[PDB]
Symmetry: C2
């Protein structure tokens, strides 16, 4: 059975990804700060039974990889999706951001996702896929982030760290994906649904399985420029 | 006369840039945390006299723009170079970097440089040049930063913030340069000066090295 780990699965796109992988017959491990308070996860569990396993965890805690390891046991991870993202300060103003907000923005969106992926990487199947929720706002060539510079810069830093990780290998043992989910209703009147976005992202993730490449793609599996 | 402001001019490439612009006849305003403790700045001042003005200021403190304003007065800045950069933790390990180190790394290398440039931007000459010391390690396409991922990521964030700032304008009133310095200080500075001058009047965002060769994002 395909083991899929979705970090940040309580609602929105994270939940949608769990639902979409379950519909494909995967065993899904869904991590959230408070699994039990998620009506979406509770409804998935009632439908999927033991094939959906909830993990209490937070990417920003030091023990998160170990808590995940306890739930996985000997199981290898075929697909690892880190779905983390905060906006940062609402003002998105370099003149105002303080040390605590800076630390929180770059730890949450860039450093902690790599930290967790790396910690678990030894359990990832050869020819598997490790994917990070990124953003079109990370793209320097598209340069679309003027109204949210801090968020975009945090996601550029994520993409940078991931590319640097790639550089440590002679040959990648799994694919490394940076994903743009689209402008998703309930995430960031938006018509693009969680279901459509999640279906698209799952297809993109599956398309990278066995390729062992680093790609920056959207929910249509179209490449984004760096 | 060209007014050139170099933020972070106490030593190394910052100092070299001050020297190189002075040799071209510019009026140079050189900012350092402790100008008086810099033998390099002190020797430049003795040689250039009033053409070098030293400014006490720290990019990481919120009073830096005001200290600069006191030296500049009403004069417009033709060239603004922000020379900042720390390595971050020696381990360069995402498993080890804590909140205080993260804040320090991204404030120093990305946020504070933009913050200062923005604060001063209204004084920059139309068709002038605002430049940031970046790194080839910032480039995602070159992907060179495996041994220093935190440093690289901090400079990618700098490049991102600068590109975003570009996007706030109807039209750029000055060029925005991200510079990779490279291997002597003198050669690097001579090259960067030529690159900065080449962008005057262009009003573009460019990521270039000491040879003025474009680097991919």
């Amino acid at each position: 059975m395909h083991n899929v780990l979705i970090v940040g699965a309580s609602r929105g796109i994270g939940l949608g990804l769990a639902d979409a992988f379950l519909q494909r017959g995967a065993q899904v491990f869904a991590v959230a700060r408070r699994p039990q308070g998620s009506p979406g996860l509770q409804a998935l569990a009632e439908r999927a039974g033991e094939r959906l396993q909830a993990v209490t965890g937070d990417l920003n805690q030091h023990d998160c990889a170990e808590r995940i390891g306890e739930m996985l046991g000997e199981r290898r991870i075929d697909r690892l999706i880190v779905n983390a993202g905060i906006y940062g300060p609402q003002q998105q103003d370099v003149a105002e951001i303080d040390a605590e907000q800076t630390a929180q923005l770059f730890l949450t969106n860039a450093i902690a996702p790599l930290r967790l992926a790396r910690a678990l990487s030894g359990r990832v199947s050869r020819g598997g896929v490790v994917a990070f929720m990124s953003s079109q706002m990370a793209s320097l060539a598209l340069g679309l982030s003027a109204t949210m510079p801090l968020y975009g810069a945090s996601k550029a830093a994520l993409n940078s760290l991931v590319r640097s990780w790639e550089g440590e290998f002679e040959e990648l043992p799994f694919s490394l994906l940076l994903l743009h989910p689209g402008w998703v209703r309930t995430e960031m009147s938006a018509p693009l649904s969680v279901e459509e976005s999640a279906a698209g992202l799952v297809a993109a993730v599956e398309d990278a399985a066995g390729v062992n490449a680093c790609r920056f793609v959207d929910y249509r599996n179209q490449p984004l420029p760096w």
